[PDB]
Design a protein around this ligand. Structure first.
Ligand code: CLA
Ligand code: CLA
Ligand code: CLA
Ligand code: CLA
Ligand code: CLA
Ligand code: CLA
Ligand SMILES: CCCCCCCCCCCCCCCC(=O)OC[C@H](COP(=O)(O)OC[C@@H](O)CO)OC(=O)CCCCCCCCCCCCCCC
Ligand code: KC2
Ligand SMILES: CC1=C(C#C/C(C)=C/C=C/C(C)=C/C=C/C=C(C)/C=C/C=C(C)/C=C/[C@@]23O[C@]2(C)C[C@@H](O)CC3(C)C)C(C)(C)C[C@H](O)C1
Ligand SMILES: CC1=C(/C=C/C(C)=C/C=C/C(C)=C/C=C/C=C(C)/C=C/C=C(C)/C=C/C2=C(C)CCCC2(C)C)C(C)(C)CCC1
Ligand SMILES: CC1=C(/C=C/C(C)=C/C=C/C(C)=C/C=C/C=C(C)/C=C/C=C(C)/C=C/C2=C(C)CCCC2(C)C)C(C)(C)CCC1
Ligand SMILES: CC1=C(C/C=C(\C)CCC[C@H](C)CCC[C@H](C)CCCC(C)C)C(=O)c2ccccc2C1=O
Lengths: 73, 143, 74, 741, 155, 219
């Protein structure tokens, strides 16, 4: 949602990092992308793809995930 | 002289009767270790081995662990020892399952019932040894 | 852009190698010369020596000259 | 008795067997039927024992081959001296050693290569050298170019004499096996006669020609005004003026008042402050003492007269309870087999080359060589590589002895038999040592990388998070630092300033400095030990399991080098001791590469640099080793990436040749991987397709082309791999050190 | 008889005849005690000699006096030394209980083909043990009298 | 530079096709082994007879051509990445000048753009690219470990495993713990497979980091 407003500046986030091996320095460094937790900056273009395709809110992405889960089922 | 002769007077077995292999010191210590001691049941073999390994397993986690320079260093070390012991007893159980598939003799480490008794002894002994080492390390100022 | 280009080029290379490997498996496992008597596919095996020798020639020429020009520039 | 006994005119002199190419071997003498014949002609060229059964003939061939090699080496010493005489700036460097870059090679202007004649000072354009020959000649006392020219002519004369000797001792008067097997007299003459008299003669040369010339040069006398060596040799008044003890003559020598010669025979130690190198009086005393030691040692073994030792009896007397018969049979083994002697000698030669590398940098023996940073790095690295290669040759020839010249009738229940009877225990325990050592030494680096990437410097194996201090090395360094007073009272300084003491510096650049040892040194030293242990594992397993193994009970029957014993037993690939050497050469290559990388980074960061008038010590890289050598990322960044700048940015400059060789060695290293990974079957089928293409045109050769043999493909891959890697390191080190130092 | 303790300077040395009219059990006990004393005294003499001038452990400043150093050692170290020695001594007792048992042979030499070389080296062990037995008592006595270590007393 | 690198790409494609087409066409048989179809697709060899028959099965043709696939795709991706880094940074006269020689690739592409990656973590601290640096070194390590299986072959490791089996069976205590499957060295085709696996995973890890981190650090 934040990336949609400012696509050219906000860096897309892939997923949160869950790692007990991270130090405080790594925690501060990986805390990026306008969020309060460590994250990985997406480099797959999925943000651009979905924004072009017509996704604008997290709810649309969640419903797409639900439907794909049902499809796999 | 000749301190290296065939093993059990068999030149064609792949071994040598060196002082290290066949000295009275080596025979005494090995035969008296719990895994070889005569008369010990599999439960007691596992028990002695478990306490033995559990007492020392806490130490590396306590001093070299991530939270060594933290007020809960010894607690984290004990928890790490418990986790490692859980992995080790899981390894023991799967080893028994894989090796001693069809067995009914019991009272023998090479049988399913004996190895299960040995694993139970190891598990309880190692948990108790980790806790005992925790208790001693809390009160090490006594000595 | 760079991640996507590298990703898809690598997968393209893998797919091409797999296509050729399964062509080889077909030749060694599923090829029937009695069915392909004097076939367009059997003639490939017939002049495989010419094909391999000419692929060797073009590979040799390309490598010799590209490496030589690069070393000349170096 | 020990006597000279030779056969006369054993072999005629004719070019008929020059024309006949493969005459030396029975199979090769038939002529070619495939291109593998051509390769085998080279492969079996110097395998004399496969050619002829007679040990006498093998010994004669080896003796004359040694003569030919000495002729080549004399021609090489001649090239060095002659190039210094003619195509050099040795006089300019002699006048101004610190600023003048030594150069003794000049390219011709043809295709633009003339830029490689870079500015080397002294009004001379040429390729800078890094061999230290200029400093060697300055130590020797050569001050003119006529001396270099005439010693080059003498070297050419000696090379001609050596070619003549090699021809004579095979074609006119060849010795007998009885002559060759006089090992006792050989040892006596090599100790007292070769080493002892060589040291005595060099000590005399130093005392008479090197001390005065070098002392005058250090005082400030220009080379033109220096009295000539022939004048110095007999002018006792001048030598008394320089060293007052000379006016007493040789009476203080013949009488045991040797203390009178204290001025020009010293135990000063340390480094000369002027030249930043070892004291030449110390070196003269050193060589004199060694001459005495070797002459004393060379009177041990028996000869025509009753006195002396028998090495047979000495060996046979050494047998213990755990060793059975002990060293019985080893005298006969080493008297009958040349390969065993070659193995031992190559091992000691390689270890000596490594020890030379370690000693020269810490105790710079030649004047103005310590400040010549390219020279130190080049010599250290070169001798390390030569040492590793010699050690692997030792392993290979030990394996060859095991395959060919071993015999249980001879070596029953001796040390060789007892070693073979528990080779399994030996190799299993060395395997465990290798796993443990590599796991610890490398996993410490990997741990450091992991914690740094996780942003946890407090969890590092650093000097400030979890210290791994080399306490024993520090203790030894402290003992050496305190040695000159307590345990070596007559020494006026430490043997090497690396252990401790003052900072020796000539002009601004630093000659020698104490080398500190911390966590990074601990880690890299254990890495060195791990690499050495794995190399020993591979080579020792190859030597022990050359006869046979649990996989192949009859491995000796197949031979020393053979491709395999088929795809059976799940695969019997590279079972041969030859293939064990082929794999051990990769590992000594890795070992020496890590050793030279450690040397380069440590000396650039902690030793080499500059010191200002106040004492501002500024190192080349800035002491980054102690804090960056703890991680493989730091090794990749602050050593390879950081120091590759001077190589890659060398285009358009005199080091552009080093840039080209950097690329070319990279190319050859990669080219080697084709042979190393690929196999003869594919290549033979490809050659079949190409042969069809040629036969279609009626030009398929009579000598049918074949893919290279399996052993040959492995050898070619190994050779290209070693050449590419060594050339990459060569160009990188030379470009970096010449640019920065 | 049957032992290897006899030597050249004193021959078969038994003035008071303890071994005379004694059982093999008592003879084996005597030889076990002899070898244990010799070995412990070797360890003691070497320990004093080395620790007098080279004692890096425990801060590198523990007293070079042998009698003061052991008192300075922490209690846990003494307990650990006692535990180690007791763990060797239980195996000594078990070796005594074994059916085959030479007095001081933890190596079990009887199963191997030994010779006069082995006998001579056992004699070497015993003679060095006697010398160390005298040496350790001498060192401790000098430490009590003068308060200096062995090498400092020699200084 | 584009001319020369395109001819290099042609070399890569042609040689990969040569290896693959030869494997496919000679899978049935060859003059060195006319009855290869009886042995099948992936077999170790035919033995040392007839001069040696290494990598003759036409599976080994695939295993050889995989190296060339990696080589040519690496050339393609280096060309793409350097030209696009220069174009994006606005200095195309770096590629147009330096790409004509190979030291330009070694310096103005690899060495120049490797700084933000290898500086992901250093002695003074760490950045968000430390994961890319760690994975860069990780891919290097796997690429290197592949050389072991590719160079060293089964006989050495088989004999070494005989030694280890002896040690495990002969040591006390541990010899009560005994395997069920007899431990053997990896088969020939298995080890070729493992070595190629370590090579490829390595390739992709190293370039992924270098391509994702240098771009981020340069823009
Ligand atoms: C190529 C076909 C295609 C694809 C790939 C998509 C993809 C998408 N559509 Mg859909 N859409 C399609 C055809 C397609 N549409 C058509 C023909 C129409 C009619 C005009 C629509 C009308 C439509 C609307 C009105 C909306 C979407 C939305 C979406 C998004 C969520 C889809 C979801 O949750 O599916 C989950 C379901 C499945 C995975 C099952 C699919 C059917 C199975 C596989 C049967 C195949 C036969 C996604 C971007 C939503 C959005 O937010 O878009 C921006 C949304 O609100 N689509
Ligand atoms: C549509 C795609 C496709 C399909 C359906 C198949 C199907 C098949 N292939 Mg394959 N193949 C493909 C693509 C495909 N291939 C590609 C792209 C390549 C080129 C690389 C190949 C190359 C190839 C060869 C050379 C061979 C086959 C063979 C086969 C057959 C057996 C494979 C087997 O046993 O798998 C089971 C395999 C495994 C369980 C091993 C998987 C190991 C994975 C890949 C490791 C991944 C790396 C690592 C673990 C991850 C690291 C993470 C980080 C650290 C099977 C019919 C074999 C055959 O027919 O023999 C007669 C055969 O010889 N294929
Ligand atoms: C940098 C490394 C390298 C190099 C240079 C080559 C070169 C070659 N490979 Mg490849 N190869 C490599 C790595 C390399 N390979 C690796 C790692 C593998 C995996 C095992 C393979 C596997 C492999 C196979 C299986 C095959 C090839 C083939 C070829 C040829 C490709 C066409 C070509 O460029 O010919 C031109 C040659 C060159 C550019 C280099 C030649 C030498 C230069 C020009 C120097 C000239 C001589 C010089 C003056 C001598 C001075 C001596 C003093 C050629 C012989 C194919 C082949 O043989 O096709 C005919 C083939 O079948 N290769
Ligand atoms: C004082 C007497 C003397 C001297 C000076 C030498 C010197 C040498 N012998 Mg030896 N040798 C001696 C007595 C001596 N030998 C005797 C008595 C025997 C018979 C038992 C032998 C039997 C013998 C054999 C069988 C061989 C040698 C070889 C060598 C050379 C060893 C390699 C080397 O470092 O060369 C150093 C070279 C120099 C210092 C240059 C000096 C050149 C001449 C002497 C001027 C060396 C030139 C090896 C050889 O053939 O090498 C050529 C060799 O294989 N010697
Ligand atoms: C980087 C490349 C590489 C690596 C990792 C190895 C590894 C090894 N080689 Mg070498 N080798 C290499 C290249 C390499 N080689 C090449 C190119 C060749 C061809 C010339 C050879 C040829 C060769 C031979 C012929 C021999 C060796 C030997 C060995 C072993 C040495 C013992 C040791 O230290 O193991 C310890 C392991 C390491 C150092 C790797 C890192 C370990 C750390 C601690 C990571 C631990 C990770 C964790 C516990 C597990 C994974 C976590 C999770 C995913 C589950 C080991 C298996 C010798 C041997 O058998 O030794 C006994 C031996 O005889 N190698
Ligand atoms: C306490 C240690 C000790 C013990 C238990 C023995 C035991 C033995 N010795 Mg003796 N021995 C010792 C110390 C000891 N020795 C020392 C230090 C020397 C060097 C002088 C010798 C020299 C020696 C020789 C040369 C020989 C023996 C032999 C023997 C054996 C047969 C004689 C016998 O019955 O002795 C029994 C011994 C005892 C019961 C110990 C009694 C100790 C008394 C109570 C103390 C006397 C010392 C005095 C108080 C202080 C001395 C001065 C100073 C230290 C204060 C027997 C196994 C003989 C042998 O083995 O023949 C095959 C033999 O040939 N011994
Ligand atoms: C590290 C390996 C130590 C274990 C293997 C050594 C086993 C060994 O080689 O046998 C014991 C052997 C001595 O044996 P003997 O005295 O019977 O042999 C002396 C020989 O020089 C006469 O052949 O070597 C040593 O004592 C070295 C001890 C390790 C130092
Ligand atoms: C008889 C020989 C002997 C053996 C075979 C042996 C074996 C082992 C092993 C198993 C292989 C372990 C795991 C272990 C561990 C520790 N030993 Mg120890 N040790 C021996 C002798 C002494 C002495 C004389 C002292 C000592 C000490 C310590 C301390 C430090 C604690 C501390 O930091 O306070 C620790 C942790 C010192 C001590 O307790 O100091 C208060 C001390 O003085 N040890 N020790
Ligand atoms: C009686 C008998 C026998 C016996 C015996 C005898 C006499 C055996 C004696 C053994 C002996 C005397 C063994 C000591 C070991 C000491 C160690 C390992 C010290 C560790 C020291 C450690 C780990 C640390 C020291 C520190 O100071 C450091 C470095 C830093 C300081 O900040 C503080 C600490 C504490 C941390 C035989 C001959 C065996 C057999 C026979 O049959 C019967
Ligand atoms: C031989 C030897 C050695 C070794 C040693 C060792 C190895 C030791 C160890 C030791 C140890 C290692 C010890 C231990 C101890 C232990 C303990 C102290 C324990 C305790 C326990 C307990 C108390 C428990 C209990 C319990 C519980 C709590 C619960 C329930 C159950 C039970 C009951 C079990 C050395 C080299 C040194 C030297 C030489 C000789
Ligand atoms: C339209 C157009 C055009 C044209 C184009 C074209 C015409 C193209 C083509 C293309 C092509 C033409 C391509 C191709 C490719 C190929 C490939 C890639 C192949 C592969 C193969 C393989 C892999 C094989 C295999 C096998 C074998 C070996 C055996 C048998 C079986 C099989 C077949 C499976 C142009 C450009 C002018 C312009 C623009 C537009
Ligand atoms: C490339 C290669 C070849 C083919 C290469 C050959 C035959 C070398 C060619 C050398 C000749 C003499 C050409 C040298 C240059 C001049 C044209 C002459 C093999 O035969 C081979 C065999 C076994 C393992 C690996 C390989 C291998 O990698």
């Amino acid at each position: 949602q934040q990336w949609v407003l400012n696509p050219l500046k906000v860096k897309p986030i892939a997923h949160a990092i869950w790692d007990p091996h991270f130090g405080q320095s790594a925690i501060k460094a990986f805390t990026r992308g306008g969020v309060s937790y460590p994250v990985n900056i997406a480099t797959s273009g999925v943000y651009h793809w979905w924004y072009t395709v017509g996704m604008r809110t997290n709810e649309d992405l969640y419903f797409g995930a639900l439907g794909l889960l049902v499809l796999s089922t | 002289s000749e301190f290296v002769k065939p093993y059990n007077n068999d030149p064609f077995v792949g071994n040598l009767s060196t002082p290290v292999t066949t000295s009275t010191a080596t025979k005494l210590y090995l035969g008296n270790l719990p895994i070889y001691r005569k008369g010990l049941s599999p439960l007691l073999r596992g028990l002695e081995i478990g306490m033995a390994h559990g007492y020392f397993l806490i130490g590396p986690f306590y001093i070299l662990g991530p939270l060594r320079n933290s007020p809960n260093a010894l607690l984290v070390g004990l928890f790490s020892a418990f986790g490692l012991i859980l992995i080790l007893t899981l390894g023991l159980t799967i080893y028994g399952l894989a090796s001693f598939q069809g067995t009914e003799g019991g009272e023998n480490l090479e049988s399913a019932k004996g190895w299960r008794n040995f694993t139970s002894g190891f598990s309880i002994g190692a948990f108790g040894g980790a806790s005992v080492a925790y208790v001693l390390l809390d009160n090490i100022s006594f000595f | 852009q760079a991640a996507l280009y590298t990703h898809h080029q690598y997968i393209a290379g893998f797919l091409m190698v797999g296509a050729f490997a399964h062509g080889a498996i077909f030749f060694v496992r599923d090829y029937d010369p009695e069915v392909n008597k004097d076939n367009v596919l059997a003639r490939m095996l017939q002049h495989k020596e010419a094909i391999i020798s000419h692929l060797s020639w073009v590979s040799l020429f390309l490598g010799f000259h590209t490496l030589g020009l690069y070393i000349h520039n170096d | 008795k020990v006597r000279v006994i030779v056969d006369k005119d054993p072999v005629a002199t004719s070019f008929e067997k020059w024309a006949q190419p493969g005459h030396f071997s029975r199979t090769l003498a038939k002529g070619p039927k495939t291109t593998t014949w051509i390769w085998n002609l080279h492969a079996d060229a110097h395998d004399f024992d496969s050619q002829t059964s007679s040990l006498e003939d093998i010994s004669r061939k080896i003796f004359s081959a040694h003569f030919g090699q000495l002729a080549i080496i004399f021609l090489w010493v001649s090239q060095a001296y002659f190039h210094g005489a003619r195509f050099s700036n040795y006089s300019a460097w002699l006048l101004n050693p610190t600023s003048i870059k030594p150069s003794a090679q000049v390219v011709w202007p043809v295709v633009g290569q003339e830029i490689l004649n870079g500015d080397v000072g002294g009004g001379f354009s040429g390729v800078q050298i890094t061999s230290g020959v200029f400093q060697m000649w300055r130590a020797s006392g050569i001050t003119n170019e006529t001396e270099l020219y005439w010693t080059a002519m003498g070297g050419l004369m000696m090379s001609a004499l050596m070619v003549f000797a090699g021809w004579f001792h095979y074609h006119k008067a060849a010795p007998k096996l009885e002559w060759f097997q006089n090992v006792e007299s050989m040892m006596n003459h090599h100790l007292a006669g070769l080493l002892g008299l060589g040291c005595l003669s060099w000590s005399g040369h130093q005392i008479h020609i090197s001390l005065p010339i070098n002392k005058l040069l250090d005082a400030g006398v220009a080379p033109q005004e220096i009295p000539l060596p022939h004048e110095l040799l007999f002018n006792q008044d001048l030598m008394a003026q320089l060293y007052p003890s000379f006016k007493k003559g040789l009476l203080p020598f013949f009488t045991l008042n040797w203390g009178e010669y204290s001025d020009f025979l010293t135990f000063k130690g340390g480094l000369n402050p002027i030249t930043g190198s070892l004291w030449l009086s110390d070196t003269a005393h050193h060589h004199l003492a060694l001459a005495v030691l070797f002459i004393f040692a060379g009177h041990m073994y028996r000869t025509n007269w009753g006195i002396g030792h028998s090495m047979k009896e000495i060996l046979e007397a050494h047998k213990g309870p755990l060793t059975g018969e002990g060293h019985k049979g080893l005298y006969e083994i080493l008297t009958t087999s040349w390969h065993a002697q070659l193995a031992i000698n190559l091992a000691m030669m390689g270890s000596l080359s490594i020890i030379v590398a370690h000693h020269m940098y810490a105790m710079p023996p030649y004047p103005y060589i310590a400040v010549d940073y390219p020279t130190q790095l080049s010599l250290f690295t070169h001798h390390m590589w030569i040492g590793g290669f010699c050690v692997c040759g030792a392993a290979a020839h030990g394996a060859i002895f095991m395959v060919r010249d071993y015999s249980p009738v001879q070596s029953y229940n001796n040390l060789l038999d007892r070693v073979l009877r528990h080779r399994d225990a030996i190799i299993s325990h060395l395997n465990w040592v290798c796993i443990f050592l590599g796991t610890h030494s490398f996993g410490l680096y990997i741990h450091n990388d992991t914690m740094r990437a996780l942003g946890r410097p407090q969890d590092m194996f650093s000097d400030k998070a979890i210290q791994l201090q080399p306490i024993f090395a520090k203790w030894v360094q402290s003992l050496h630092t305190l040695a000159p007073g307590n345990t070596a009272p007559n020494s006026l300084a430490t043997a090497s300033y690396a252990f401790g003491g003052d900072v020796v510096a000539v002009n601004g650049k630093i000659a020698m400095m104490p080398i500190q040892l911390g966590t990074a040194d601990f880690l890299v030293h254990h890495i060195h030990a791990f690499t050495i242990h794995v190399t020993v594992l591979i080579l020792l397993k190859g030597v022990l399991f050359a006869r046979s193994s649990r996989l192949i009970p009859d491995k000796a029957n197949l031979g020393f080098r053979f491709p395999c014993d088929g795809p059976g037993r799940g695969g019997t690939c590279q079972v041969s001791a030859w293939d064990h050497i082929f794999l051990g050469l990769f590992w000594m290559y890795n070992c020496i590469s890590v050793v030279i990388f450690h040397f380069s980074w440590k000396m650039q960061s902690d030793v080499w640099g500059t010191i200002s008038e106040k004492g501002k010590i500024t190192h080349i890289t800035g002491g980054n080793f102690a804090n960056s050598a703890l991680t493989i990322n730091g090794w990749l960044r602050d050593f390879l990436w950081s120091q590759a700048s001077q190589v890659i940015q060398s285009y358009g400059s005199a080091l552009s040749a080093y840039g080209i060789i950097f690329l070319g060695a990279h190319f050859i290293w990669a080219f080697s991987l084709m042979f190393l990974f690929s196999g003869r079957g594919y290549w033979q089928e490809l050659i079949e397709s190409v042969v069809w293409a040629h036969n279609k045109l009626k030009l398929a050769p009579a000598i049918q082309p074949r893919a290279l043999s399996i052993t040959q493909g492995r050898a070619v891959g190994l050779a290209h791999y070693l050449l590419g890697g060594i050339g990459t390191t060569w160009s990188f080190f030379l470009a970096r050190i010449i640019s920065v130092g | 008889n049957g032992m290897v303790g006899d030597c050249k300077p004193l021959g078969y040395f038994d003035p008071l005849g303890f071994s005379k009219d004694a059982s093999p059990e008592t003879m084996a006990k005597f030889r076990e005690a002899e070898l244990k004393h010799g070995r412990v005294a070797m360890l003691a003499c070497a320990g004093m000699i080395t620790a007098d001038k080279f004692h890096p452990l425990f801060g590198g400043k523990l007293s070079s006096n042998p009698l003061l150093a052991i008192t300075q050692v922490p209690k846990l170290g003494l307990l650990q030394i006692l535990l180690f020695i007791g763990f060797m001594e239980v195996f000594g007792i078990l070796n005594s209980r074994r059916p085959d048992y030479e007095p001081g042979n933890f190596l079990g030499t009887s199963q191997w083909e030994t010779t006069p070389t082995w006998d001579a080296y056992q004699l070497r062990e015993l003679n060095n043990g006697r010398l160390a037995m005298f040496g350790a008592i001498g060192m401790l006595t000098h430490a009590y009298i003068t308060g200096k270590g062995p090498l400092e007393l020699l200084d | 530079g584009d001319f020369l690198v395109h001819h290099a790409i042609a070399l890569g494609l042609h040689t990969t096709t040569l290896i693959l087409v030869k494997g496919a066409l000679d899978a049935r048989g060859s003059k060195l082994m006319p009855d290869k179809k009886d042995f099948g697709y992936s077999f170790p060899c035919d033995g040392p007879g007839r001069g040696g028959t290494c990598d003759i099965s036409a599976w080994d043709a695939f295993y050889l051509a995989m190296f060339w696939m990696l080589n040519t795709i690496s050339w393609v991706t280096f060309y793409w990445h350097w030209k696009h880094l220069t174009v994006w940074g606005g200095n195309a006269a770096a590629f147009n000048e330096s790409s004509t020689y190979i030291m330009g690739w070694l310096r103005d592409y690899l060495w120049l753009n490797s700084s933000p990656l290898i500086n992901g973590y250093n002695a003074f601290g760490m950045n968000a690219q430390a994961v890319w640096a760690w994975m860069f070194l990780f891919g290097h390590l796997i690429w290197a470990t592949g050389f072991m299986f590719l160079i060293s072959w089964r006989g050495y490791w088989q004999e070494l495993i005989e030694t280890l089996v002896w040690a495990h069976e002969r040591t006390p205590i541990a010899n009560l713990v005994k395997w069920r499957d007899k431990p053997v060295a990896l088969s020939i085709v298995q080890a070729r497979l493992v070595g190629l696996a370590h090579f490829t995973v390595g390739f992709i890890f190293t370039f992924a980091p270098f391509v994702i981190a240098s771009t981020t650090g340069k823009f």
